[PDB]
């Protein structure tokens, strides 16, 4: 059964020319399609029959196919074009390529915006207690999250998501701290400390 | 103008049969090719098979022994059956349309996630994240399997809504949060209700959030 | 004017093997959709013989109905095996075809096929790299013909043509004198066990009957297989109605009918006069080939 190989991870600085390769034996005898997929949504056809463009697709998108290699090229790559790119043999024995993530360099650093909610009184009536730390709109896509009860690191019960790309190309993350109602009431404050690229952003709550 | 809409359970036990249905709207089955495609979490696309109105089919050879695709022109839908299912079948399942048997997919459905697991379905608890621009929200706690959809004021409130990706806890249950930013002036005078939909448990909660 | 030309007898498969990408509209051909292997046959005055017998089988339908065998090898890409028979025949191919098919001298279906992303030239003797939008997904019929099953033996029928020295690839005798040459549109027939039989005159008669290929059935029209209909005092899965000829043989339920079945006009068993005798052929057609006549 056929296999087409793309590179993971192509990188390009804005306005420059990105090129995604897709290889397989005698691939030049088959027609090739390309699809762009953005976080959380369905693939979108961007190139079909090696080089044609669907009605409504920016003309900076072009493609070509010859020999053992098809190529999808974006001229003047924008931030808009950060996505995964799949090639397909849209011919007799159909197969997709493994996919290429396209990162467009030089986008500006942004610090996380952090919102921190205390336990709801409904949850305290359920004799449970959760603190929610919501972390949005930061670039690059890496944070670390430390929790304090007044002064000192929190023993246990924190769960943090890996960061995930938003629509606007920035990242989001969540941290949850679970406590007994007694642990909530017994301290004077709780803090979520989010550290992004050396600098720390800290919100607090109190019973 | 076509819309494709996948429906089916979100949870299938190992060795059992998975079943999905795609409903075509604003169009018809007609003479197109109708395909099922899947994507394992974090991985690439794989084509499963196609059918056309006459009932004739063509399957990925890696899967042909476990795949059935069927069509219902009178109801404008088509269906997938994937049998003796395994953890490798956990994926988002997409329906897609193509003009010809070269499978140029120019219309796609939204995708349904199907998780293969022996775990039981569990419907979520919903709690209000009261406001202290003001942020308010809904905490959706301890559900299985993913996904859960949230709307605010029956979908009337869209600008300023951030529904965060779920955390998967040590318990094996998921949780997520929905937050909406509003005018601080409005907080005494507008109603904010979050609507939580967990299909795999047929749970549906509408929670009011006040200061 | 007949509204059921796309409601085909037999299976109605109009595709050549290894060109499978318009099966949804070509396997079978029916009322809806476009088929690059079939539609051309219904354009006004392009295939006159087939249009006078449009409820008989195309060459491709006859292959998939096992009436006609596929040549051996079944394609050829463009130099020796093909192109002998192909080069004596003068044909115009529309643009964007990768394939074109014909009945060869042995009475089998042969084809010429271009490489991927190549098309046939207007004379169908060469292939060139894709000019234009899109290759079509079917094969172009190079002959004007129609077909039918037959058990009539023609192992004794050989081309006989007065004053003709060569017609196509067949040399009929030795002519020592000088010859005149021309591309001629020549009637031919193919029988059980015969080679292609070229003819000086085409002479045909239809004998009508009430067999399944004499009716077309339909539920926007949709095709319905008459084999689902119960004959009178017999079993069947669906409920049907039709004209009087149909009701004379099948059960007729004017109120609970799923489908209606009319007589397919022009249908029947076709016979051809060969050296004064009437014989039932497998295919009959016209072909534009080189002919050499004595002077």
């Amino acid at each position: 059964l056929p296999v087409l190989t793309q590179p993971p991870s192509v990188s390009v600085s804005p306005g420059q020319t990105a090129s995604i390769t897709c290889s397989g034996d005698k691939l030049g005898d088959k027609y090739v399609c390309w699809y762009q997929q953005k976080p959380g949504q369905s693939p979108v056809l961007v190139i079909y029959q090696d080089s044609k463009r669907p009605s409504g697709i920016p003309e900076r998108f072009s493609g070509s196919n010859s020999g053992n290699t098809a190529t999808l090229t974006i001229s003047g790559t924008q931030a808009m074009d950060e996505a995964d790119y799949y090639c397909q043999a849209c011919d007799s024995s159909t197969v997709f390529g493994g996919g290429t993530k396209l990162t467009v360099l030089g986008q500006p650093k942004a610090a996380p915006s952090v919102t921190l909610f205390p336990p709801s009184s409904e949850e305290l009536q359920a004799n449970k207690a959760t603190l929610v730390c919501l972390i949005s709109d930061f670039y690059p896509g890496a944070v670390t999250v430390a929790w304090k009860a007044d002064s000192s690191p929190v023993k246990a019960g924190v769960e943090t998501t890996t960061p995930s790309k938003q629509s606007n190309n920035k990242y989001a993350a969540s941290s949850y701290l679970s406590l007994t109602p007694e642990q909530w009431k017994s301290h004077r404050s709780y803090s979520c400390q989010v550290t992004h690229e050396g600098s720390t952003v800290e919100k607090t709550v109190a019973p | 103008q076509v819309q494709l809409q996948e429906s089916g359970p979100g949870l299938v036990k190992p060795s059992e049969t998975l079943s999905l249905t795609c409903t075509v709207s604003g169009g018809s089955i007609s003479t197109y090719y109708w395909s099922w495609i899947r994507q394992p979490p974090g991985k690439g696309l794989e084509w499963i098979g196609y059918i056309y109105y006459s009932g004739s089919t063509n399957y990925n050879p890696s899967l042909k022994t476990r795949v059935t695709i069927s069509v219902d022109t009178s109801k404008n839908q088509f269906s997938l059956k994937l049998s003796s299912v395994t953890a490798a079948d956990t994926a988002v399942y997409y329906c897609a349309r193509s003009d010809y048997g070269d499978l140029i997919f120019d219309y796609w459905g939204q995708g349904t996630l199907v998780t293969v697991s022996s775990a039981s379905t569990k419907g979520p608890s919903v709690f209000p994240l009261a406001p202290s621009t003001a942020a308010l929200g809904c905490l959706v706690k301890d559900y299985f399997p993913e996904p859960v959809t949230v709307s605010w004021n029956s979908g009337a409130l869209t600008s300023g809504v951030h529904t965060f990706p779920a955390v998967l806890q040590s318990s094996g249950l998921y949780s997520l949060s929905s937050v909406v930013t509003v005018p601080s002036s409005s907080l005494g005078t507008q109603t904010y209700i979050c609507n939580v939909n967990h299909k795999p448990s047929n749970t549906k909660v509408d929670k009011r959030v006040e200061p | 004017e007949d509204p059921h030309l796309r409601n085909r007898p037999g299976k109605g498969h109009n595709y050549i093997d290894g060109m499978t990408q318009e099966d949804a509209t070509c396997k079978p051909v029916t009322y809806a959709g476009a088929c690059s292997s079939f539609d051309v046959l219904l354009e006004k005055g392009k295939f006159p013989l087939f249009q006078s017998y449009a409820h008989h089988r195309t060459l491709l339908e006859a292959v998939h109905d096992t009436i006609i065998a596929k040549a051996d090898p079944p394609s050829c890409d463009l130099g020796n095996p093909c192109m002998k028979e192909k080069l004596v025949m003068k044909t115009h191919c529309p643009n964007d075809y990768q394939s074109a098919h014909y009945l060869n001298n042995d009475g089998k279906m042969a084809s010429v096929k271009c490489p991927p992303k190549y098309e046939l030239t207007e004379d169908c003797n060469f292939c060139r790299q894709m000019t234009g939008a899109s290759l079509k997904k079917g094969s172009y019929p190079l002959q004007d013909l129609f077909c039918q099953s037959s058990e009539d033996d023609g192992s004794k029928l050989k081309t006989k043509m007065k004053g003709v020295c060569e017609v196509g690839v067949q040399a009929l005798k030795k002519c020592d004198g000088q010859l005149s040459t021309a591309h001629e549109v020549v009637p031919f027939a193919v029988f059980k066990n015969s080679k292609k039989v070229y003819l000086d005159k085409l002479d045909l008669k239809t004998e009508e009957n009430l067999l399944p290929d004499s009716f077309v059935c339909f539920e926007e029209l949709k095709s319905f297989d008459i084999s689902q209909c119960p004959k009178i005092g017999g079993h069947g899965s669906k409920k049907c109605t039709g004209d009087a000829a149909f009701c004379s043989a099948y059960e007729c339920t004017a109120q609970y009918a799923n489908a209606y079945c009319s007589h397919a006009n022009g249908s029947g068993i076709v016979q051809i006069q060969v050296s004064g005798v009437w014989k039932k052929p497998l295919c009959v057609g016209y072909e534009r080939v080189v002919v050499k006549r004595e002077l």
Side-chain angles (χ1 to χ4, degrees), chain C residues 104-108 154-159 170 188-198:
Chain C
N104 73 18
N105 206 51
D106 301 319
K108 306 188 189 189
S155 67
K156 195 205 128 290
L157 308 174
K158 238 42 195 200
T159 296
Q170 304 176 7
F188 66 85
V190 170
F191 301 88
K192 190 184 144 140
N193 302 318
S194 89
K195 271 166 168 26
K196 196 187 266 156
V197 173
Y198 288 110

Side-chain angles (χ1 to χ4, degrees), chain B residues 103-122:
Chain B
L103 301 175
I104 297 174
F105 306 117
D106 51 348
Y107 298 93
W108 292 71
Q110 278 64 62
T112 324
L113 166 66
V114 178
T115 70
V116 181
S117 148
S118 65
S120 267
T121 279
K122 191 192 169 74

Side-chain angles (χ1 to χ4, degrees), chain A residues 28-30 49-50 52 91, chain C residues 21 116-117 130 132-135:
Chain A
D29 280 341
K30 286 166 143 32
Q49 291 214 306
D50 291 349
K52 308 215 247 274
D91 225 310
Chain C
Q21 309 186 349
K117 317 183 189 195
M130 198 42 199
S134 307
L135 274 187

Side-chain angles (χ1 to χ4, degrees), chain C residues 56-262:
Chain C
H56 286 83
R57 287 174 166 75
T58 58
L59 179 51
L60 292 175
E61 281 160 349
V63 159
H64 301 308
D65 280 349
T66 59
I67 295 162
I68 292 289
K70 297 155 58 166
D72 175 34
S75 319
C76 94
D77 75 334
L78 328 64
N80 205 350
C82 48
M83 288 14 248
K84 202 285 200 219
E85 276 182 282
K86 175 59 205 76
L87 276 168
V88 313
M89 63 193 282
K90 180 135 195 231
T91 56
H92 173 280
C93 277
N95 290 341
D96 311 336
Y97 275 95
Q98 202 182 0
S99 173
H101 56 282
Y102 66 95
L103 204 55
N104 73 18
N105 206 51
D106 301 319
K108 306 188 189 189
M109 182 182 83
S111 93
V112 298
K113 213 209 175 130
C114 292
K117 317 183 189 195
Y118 281 50
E119 51 159 32
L120 289 163
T121 50
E122 289 80 8
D123 70 350
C124 315
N125 289 337
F126 305 81
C127 296
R128 87 193 144 214
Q129 183 155 355
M130 198 42 199
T131 88
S134 307
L135 274 187
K136 282 143 145 83
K137 303 321 197 327
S139 173
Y140 181 69
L142 298 167
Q143 289 153 331
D144 175 18
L145 64 67
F146 63 96
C147 300
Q148 82 193 326
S149 71
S150 174
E151 275 297 302
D152 207 7
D153 176 71
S155 67
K156 195 205 128 290
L157 308 174
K158 238 42 195 200
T159 296
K160 312 148 269 205
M161 278 177 85
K162 46 201 152 66
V164 167
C165 213
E166 285 157 53
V167 48
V169 292
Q170 304 176 7
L172 316 180
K173 49 164 169 172
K174 180 55 191 287
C175 309
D176 289 297
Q178 301 205 10
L179 312 170
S180 85
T181 311
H183 283 115
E184 302 189 13
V185 167
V186 187
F188 66 85
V190 170
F191 301 88
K192 190 184 144 140
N193 302 318
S194 89
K195 271 166 168 26
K196 196 187 266 156
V197 173
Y198 288 110
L199 303 152
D200 271 331
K201 214 174 92 44
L202 190 51
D203 215 282
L204 300 166
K205 61 166 178 185
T206 300
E207 274 163 33
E208 297 193 321
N209 55 54
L210 298 176
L211 299 189
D213 289 338
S214 286
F215 303 97
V216 295
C217 303
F218 55 95
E219 324 204 336
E220 163 129 11
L221 318 153
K222 210 219 200 205
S223 269
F224 185 90
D225 186 4
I226 204 187
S227 74
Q228 290 177 302
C229 292
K231 285 197 139 127
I232 285 155
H235 283 99
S237 72
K238 305 289 185 173
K239 317 291 229 161
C240 322
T241 322
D243 58 14
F246 173 72
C247 300
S248 91
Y250 298 79
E251 296 184 12
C252 279
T253 88
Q255 293 147 282
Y256 304 150
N258 306 146
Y260 189 90
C261 301
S262 324

Side-chain angles (χ1 to χ4, degrees), chain B residues 81-192:
Chain B
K81 263 149 185 91
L82 180 71
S83 70
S84 82
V85 152
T86 279
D89 300 298
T90 278
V92 184
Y93 286 78
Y94 290 102
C95 50
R97 196 188 76 187
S98 95
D99 275 355
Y100 284 119
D102 55 355
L103 301 175
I104 297 174
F105 306 117
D106 51 348
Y107 298 93
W108 292 71
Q110 278 64 62
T112 324
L113 166 66
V114 178
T115 70
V116 181
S117 148
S118 65
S120 267
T121 279
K122 191 192 169 74
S125 266
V126 181
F127 296 108
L129 303 173
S132 148
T133 39
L136 62 101
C138 262
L139 169 64
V140 187
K141 208 154 66 98
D142 288 341
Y143 69 86
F144 189 83
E146 257 203 308
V148 147
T149 46
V150 194
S151 56
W152 285 93
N153 285 1
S154 289
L157 202 60
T158 280
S159 148
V161 170
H162 197 160
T163 292
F164 285 75
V167 71
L168 176 68
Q169 287 156 282
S170 267
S171 63
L173 293 176
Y174 292 83
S175 283
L176 59 62
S177 278
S178 208
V179 67
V180 52
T181 307
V182 299
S184 203
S185 148
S186 72
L187 267 190
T189 61
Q190 258 83 51
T191 280
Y192 295 110

Side-chain angles (χ1 to χ4, degrees), chain A residues 17-159:
Chain A
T17 290
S19 99
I20 307 295
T21 201
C22 161
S23 323
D25 201 9
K26 288 275 84 200
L27 186 62
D29 280 341
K30 286 166 143 32
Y31 279 118
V32 167
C33 291
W34 289 90
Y35 306 81
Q36 154 178 281
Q37 187 174 28
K38 275 185 190 185
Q41 30 198 63
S42 314
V44 172
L45 175 67
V46 294
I47 288 290
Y48 74 95
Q49 291 214 306
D50 291 349
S51 56
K52 308 215 247 274
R53 246 193 326 279
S55 147
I57 280 190
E59 331 188 49
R60 50 165 189 290
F61 281 97
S62 99
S64 77
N65 174 9
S66 147
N68 296 288
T69 309
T71 310
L72 170 76
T73 82
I74 318 168
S75 51
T77 49
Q78 309 201 324
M80 246 189 58
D81 304 336
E82 222 164 22
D84 294 335
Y85 288 95
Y86 288 96
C87 71
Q88 177 215 352
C90 40
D91 225 310
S92 47
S93 297
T94 204
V95 64
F96 287 87
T100 304
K101 176 168 261 71
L102 192 271
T103 89
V104 48
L105 298 137
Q107 302 171 68
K109 284 197 160 42
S113 69
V114 180
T115 301
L116 168 64
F117 296 99
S120 75
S121 67
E122 295 74 343
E123 186 176 27
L124 294 159
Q125 269 173 359
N127 224 65
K128 270 206 92 180
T130 313
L131 297 153
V132 189
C133 191
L134 298 174
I135 315 175
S136 35
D137 269 286
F138 56 101
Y139 190 101
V143 278
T144 50
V145 183
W147 289 87
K148 317 248 169 278
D150 273 313
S151 147
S152 59
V154 152
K155 37 177 273 276
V158 0
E159 317 257 17

